[PDB]
Ligand binder design. Structure first.
Ligand SMILES: Cc1nc(NC(=O)NC2CCCCC2)c(C)c([C@H](OC(C)(C)C)C(=O)O)c1-c1ccc2c(c1C)CCCO2
Ligand SMILES: Cc1nc(NC(=O)NC2CCCCC2)c(C)c([C@H](OC(C)(C)C)C(=O)O)c1-c1ccc2c(c1C)CCCO2
Lengths: 139, 139
């Protein structure tokens, strides 16, 4: 429940890679579809995320993801430390499946799924919860 | 100062296109580097943004950006309406210039610049302000 904790993983769909970030306290996510499951992709993603949110620690279900020099450079620069129960990859995958017919590209469907999950209330939505948590923590 | 208002534009650097989003009330931004300045890129960006934040209206300095069918589809689905003094593209560009030497790719420098701007206090930072504004508006 610490507010600066995020979880990062890659799932595979349609021979494509989806990078999924979860803010643990709230259940909010960001995701992107990447061409390849490399360290460079992760590092860049981390950079984007850190600029957006106050990211203090990151946990992953695959430790080897975080061994690249590039990833380390990103965590060093942005001041992120590594951390050593979702499972929203299933839920996200579920939502992607429902809307997949709607879009040509997998990435579009993924973004649609992110939108639905973050928005849905079950009574704040995750999108509401993350702002509430972060703002409160600020003062 | 309405909390759901965002501003979207493209600047050019190094023969590359940067899409920049500003949350007007706070000065917070998100940016991406895109290959080409197309409607499809914008639509996809909008989707990502809308999932992340509560986006009610979007203004741009180039109205023709928003004429593509693809963009319209994105605004329709996410419930965004069009809206008809930054100028942070200069400031962002300024920051990109300072750090450009640090990275090989322009995109990395851009993300670095986003991070610096959102973080900097001058006394909340923009990153703080956007959460404060959105959370407050929620209750
Ligand atoms: C509306 C839309 N179109 C395309 N591609 C097209 O060829 N569209 C032409 C537009 C002129 C008239 C004939 C059809 C695509 C590719 C998309 C989506 O792709 C992007 C990258 C643009 C998001 C897609 O993957 O389906 C869309 C589109 C755009 C936004 C959007 C949705 C779609 C289908 C679905 C709902 C969420 O918002
Ligand atoms: C550290 C880093 N490296 C590369 N590329 C490499 O070839 N790195 C190898 C790593 C093994 C030992 C020799 C050097 C790149 C391209 C980057 C940046 O690119 C990505 C896409 C990975 C972000 C870059 O554009 O410079 C970096 C890198 C990664 C993170 C990072 C920074 C850099 C330079 C700069 C500070 C912010 O965080």
């Amino acid at each position: 429940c610490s507010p600066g904790i995020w979880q990062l993983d890659c799932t595979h769909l349609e021979g494509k890679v989806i990078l999924v970030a979860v803010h643990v306290a709230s259940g909010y996510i960001e995701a992107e579809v990447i061409p390849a499951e490399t360290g460079q992709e992760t590092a860049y993603f981390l950079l984007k995320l850190a600029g957006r949110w106050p990211v203090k620690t990151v946990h992953t279900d695959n430790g080897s993801n975080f061994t690249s020099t590039t990833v380390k450079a990103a965590c060093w620069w942005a001041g992120i430390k590594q951390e050593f129960i979702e499972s929203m990859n299933k839920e996200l995958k579920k939502i992607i499946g429902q809307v997949r017919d709607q879009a040509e590209h997998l990435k579009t469907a993924v973004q649609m799924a992110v939108f639905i999950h973050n928005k849905k209330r079950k009574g704040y939505s995750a999108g509401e919860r993350i702002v509430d948590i972060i703002a409160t923590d600020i003062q």
